[PDB]
Design a protein around this ligand. Structure first.
Ligand SMILES: C[C@H]1CCC[C@@H](O)CCC/C=C/c2cc(O)cc(O)c2C(=O)O1
Ligand SMILES: C[C@H]1CCC[C@@H](O)CCC/C=C/c2cc(O)cc(O)c2C(=O)O1
Lengths: 269, 268
């Protein structure tokens, strides 16, 4: 029942994408590592509730690596939002609910603000607004040193579930290993300044639902809680840390389904 | 230069208290374990900046154990605030900056709201507003079981610095051993419903500075960040988790001094 295919957009990207189900569109945008197999279990659970679920590897990453250098260097939320709109156009997805974590969170907020006609509602998780010098500084290391250090960081610091993270398996981890240097060079210096949450009044009243991981150290996304509260945006927690779709796929799926259902009800009302 | 003494208040409590320094009064209210030796290093560092610093063991805890049962059972923020005002009265402290964590945070917000003429400014850290059934359920266990469970939770889960926690030393840990059952039976079922943060508008424009531990899991005090932001209260982070005065005593002392100095400037 799952479509697994490729599609090229006129900006030069050949995307790997997956699609399952029929009904209103839900689009799952990856975190900065750009790997959509992390959604595999949740895609089936969401689609089984009457939704068409689409996801894809991000440009330069995993199976979407056939892309121009512009699409994975000096990356901003606004560049990623333009890329996501390009694949939604190619797949004839006119109206979508969107989810994203990390750079995907910055992307879905940029999508909702920039393309309001196209986005039913956005779910953002752990949106990076601050530069982190220790992360930015990995960009000057050799590829194999970046891959070693960031594989260790993802497992031990932010996975929210070491058994589930390792259980992604060799094929996924081999793709992530090649993505770490692309991520490290392209994302950490340019994503946080692009954060589309600097104008709090622009967020007020928008169909946005914001989460942080329950186990994430308070300092990591303290600023997200403050910003969401100042904007009156619904803010809550998911179990785990940065990858709830890996650590707690059933809870993640239920959240996505219940939030989309809430916005479908409010759309008619 | 540290005074270490006792004082009796007419509510029946004989307090163990310490005091150091000369200048505006700063009062350090313990967390629910009620043990003021946790402030030892910070009391000297704060007093050295030109403050009279006072702290005390809480009623029924450590060296303030000579107290009526009502002061350490069915404990609320409003009861604790009334007890702290009693010791400030006895020590002739008319105007005070106050710090508290946990039940001490509930106490200092109840003090600022209930006794505004007495409180220059309050610093609250990690204020519990939710019942936690697993913690509440320790109340029905035997004393030795409560002490073993909670000693482990403090050391391994929420100290924010296990080496600094261990370094409080054998005497402090022997007092905490006896406090754990008193705390378990008197605090976790009654402190959260008494949280003086039900009325967001009552907090607005008050001289309150709120913190959460940087390493504390987001879910523990997520509600504090939301409430402070809704009330326009200054909200920030300290290093560590629930006991910054243990884990990071120099950062803690600098925060208490700089915050007190900010409110002394604004007062004038
Ligand atoms: C892969 C995730 C892990 C974040 C975990 C999060 O808990 C810790 C922060 C690590 C930084 C993540 C991040 C930072 C940026 O500036 C840009 C990004 O795209 C990310 C990002 O996508 O990082
Ligand atoms: C000793 C501290 C530890 C806080 C750890 C901090 O991480 C919060 C987790 C444990 C709950 C503590 C607590 C709960 C209450 O209902 C009442 C209280 O007075 C406390 C309290 O004072 O607990």
């Amino acid at each position: 029942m799952r479509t697994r295919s490729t599609i090229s957009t006129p900006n030069g990207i050949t995307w790997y994408y997956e699609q399952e189900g029929t009904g209103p569109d839900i689009v799952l945008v990856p975190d900065g590592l750009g790997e959509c197999q992390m959604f595999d279990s949740s895609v089936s659970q969401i689609a089984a509730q009457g939704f068409r679920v689409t996801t894809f590897d991000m440009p330069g990453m995993s199976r979407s690596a056939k892309a121009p250098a512009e699409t994975y260097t000096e990356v901003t939320a606004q560049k990623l939002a333009s890329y996501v709109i390009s694949i939604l156009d190619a797949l004839d997805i006119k109206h979508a609910t969107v989810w994203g974590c990390s750079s995907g969170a910055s992307t879905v907020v940029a999508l909702l603000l920039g393309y309001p006609d196209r986005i039913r509602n956005a779910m953002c998780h752990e949106l990076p607004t601050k530069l982190l010098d220790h992360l930015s500084n990995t960009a000057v290391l050799e590829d194999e040193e970046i891959s070693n250090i960031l594989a260790n960081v993802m497992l031990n610091d932010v996975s929210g579930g070491s058994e589930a993270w390792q259980a992604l398996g060799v094929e996924v981890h081999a793709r992530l290993h090649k993505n770490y240097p692309v991520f490290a060079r392209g994302y950490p210096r340019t994503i946080p300044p692009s954060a589309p949450v600097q104008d709090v009044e622009a967020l007020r009243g928008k169909p946005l639902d914001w989460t942080v991981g329950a186990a994430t150290p308070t300092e990591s996304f303290f600023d997200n809680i403050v910003t969401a509260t100042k904007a009156g945006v619904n803010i809550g927690l998911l179990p785990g840390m940065h990858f709830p779709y890996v650590s707690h796929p059933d809870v993640f799926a239920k959240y996505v389904v219940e939030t989309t259902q809430k916005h479908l009800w409010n759309s008619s009302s």
